[PDB]
Each structure stands twice: as structure tokens, then as C-alpha cells.
Amino acid sequence: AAVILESIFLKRSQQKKKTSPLNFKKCLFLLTVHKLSYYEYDFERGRRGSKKGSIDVEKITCVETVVPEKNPPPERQIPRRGEMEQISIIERFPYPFQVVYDEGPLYVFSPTEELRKRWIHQLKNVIRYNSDLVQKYHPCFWIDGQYLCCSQTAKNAMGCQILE
Ligand SMILES: [Mg+2]
Ligand SMILES: [Zn+2]
């Protein structure tokens, strides 16, 4: 329908094995009242490329922040306390959040706190009247076959922490 949000974020890809490396991908994210989708970004023409994936807003169960990595690469280092910068806002994505649905959590990294806050508020908005909304979540990432919060090995494992 109408695009509520358009952003370039770092997305962690669907992990292939517990001993296969983590691929991060810079993607164009669109949010409508109906769909949340990622596209390839045509940087040269300044537009969205092929549609990489779409999640029906109704199948979303949860949206929150994630506890950030302990030793992130410079690409995801959270800067010290205290305007925009054209380069750093498409090169540094330090601020993670998770979109939980039927097939586990999708991890997205925002270049700013403000852009992450904006995305979480708007998604919480469009999912409010969902049937399957959950009251528990994993505050930490699912890394190398387990949640780092509760060592649970199922991806769609019940959240180890209750939402406040
Ligand atoms: Mg445009
Ligand atoms: Zn957990």
C-alpha cells in the first residue's frame, strides 16, 4: 500500500550450520501495514533491486532490541556518548533488533538508536492486533546452534525472558 519506513540495514543471513560462518548483508528494508520486506539495493541507480524476502506483518509474534555483541567488528562498534554523517550512516550499523515470526528471529542492525527506536515503535504499532503475539523473548542472539541467553538449541524455542 503506502511505505511507512524505508531504510538500509545490515541483516544477518539464515545460518546454514552451527559450524558455517555468519554472513551479514546490507539490504533495503520496507515496512507496509501488510508486509515487511528486504530488497537488494542498487547503489549506482539509487533504487531497490530484486526482492530478497517478505514477511507478512500478521505472522510477526515479537519485536524488541537484542543485547549487542561483546566484541563486534568495527562495522558494528557502538560509538561513545555524543548530527548525521552520510558515510557512517551506510557503513556502521551498531544497533540490533529482532523480528520474531514462525521461522525464528530475523536480526537487523540499524546505524542509529533513533532509527532502531523508530522501526521498533512502528512495527509494534502494525502488529498490535496480531493473534500469535508472545509474552516471552530471547534478549540475546542465537549464535552457533544455541541462544546465548538460555543455551536452548531450538530456533523457535520459547523466550527465556518475559516482556515488561
Ligand atoms: Mg527512492
Ligand atoms: Zn533465551
Swiss-Prot record:
Residues binding 1D-myo-inositol 1,3,4,5-tetrakisphosphate = K25, C27, Y38, K52
Subcellular location field:
Cytoplasm; Cell membrane; Nucleus; Membrane raft
Q: Which disease relates to this protein according to its record?
A: X-linked agammaglobulinemia: Humoral immunodeficiency disease which results in developmental defects in the maturation pathway of B-cells. Affected boys have normal levels of pre-B-cells in their bone marrow but virtually no circulating mature B-lymphocytes. This results in a lack of immunoglobulins of all classes and leads to recurrent bacterial infections like otitis, conjunctivitis, dermatitis, sinusitis in the first few years of life, or even some patients present overwhelming sepsis or meningitis, resulting in death in a few hours.
After translation, the protein is modified as follows: Phosphorylation at Ser-20 and Ser-110 creates a binding site for PIN1 at these Ser-Pro motifs, and promotes it's recruitment.
Q: Where is the PH domain?
A: 2-128
Q: How does it assemble?
A: Part of a complex composed of EEIG1, TNFRSF11A/RANK, PLCG2, GAB2, TEC and BTK; complex formation increases in the presence of TNFSF11/RANKL. Binds GTF2I through the PH domain. Interacts with SH3BP5 via the SH3 domain. Interacts with IBTK via its PH domain. Interacts with ARID3A, CAV1, FASLG, PIN1, TLR8 and TLR9. Interacts with MPL/TPOR.
| Phenotype when changing T32P | In XLA; severe
- Protein name, UniProt field: Tyrosine-protein kinase BTK
Q: What does this protein do?
A: Non-receptor tyrosine kinase indispensable for B lymphocyte development, differentiation and signaling. Binding of antigen to the B-cell antigen receptor (BCR) triggers signaling that ultimately leads to B-cell activation. After BCR engagement and activation at the plasma membrane, phosphorylates PLCG2 at several sites, igniting the downstream signaling pathway through calcium mobilization, followed by activation of the protein kinase C (PKC) family members. PLCG2 phosphorylation is performed in close cooperation with the adapter protein B-cell linker protein BLNK.
Using the record's annotations, give every residue carrying the modification Phosphotyrosine.
Y39
- Which residues are involved in binding Zn(2+)? H138, C149, C150, C160
What does the domain comment read?
The PH domain mediates the binding to inositol polyphosphate and phosphoinositides, leading to its targeting to the plasma membrane. It is extended in the BTK kinase family by a region designated the TH (Tec homology) domain, which consists of about 80 residues preceding the SH3 domain.
- Positions in coiled-coil regions: none
Q: Which gene encodes it?
A: BTK
Q: Result of mutating E40K? A: No effect on phosphorylation of GTF2I
Zinc-finger (Btk-type) residue ranges come to 130-164
Instruction: Name the segments for region: Inositol-(1,3,4,5)-tetrakisphosphate 1-binding.
Output: 11-23
Domain of life per record: Eukaryota
**Hey, what tissues is this thing expressed in?**
Predominantly expressed in B-lymphocytes.
Q: Which part of the complete sequence is present?
A: 2 to 169 of 659
Tell me which residues bear Phosphoserine. S20, S54, S110
Q: Which residues carry this modification: N-acetylalanine?
A: A1
Write out the similarity annotation.
Answer: Belongs to the protein kinase superfamily. Tyr protein kinase family. TEC subfamily.
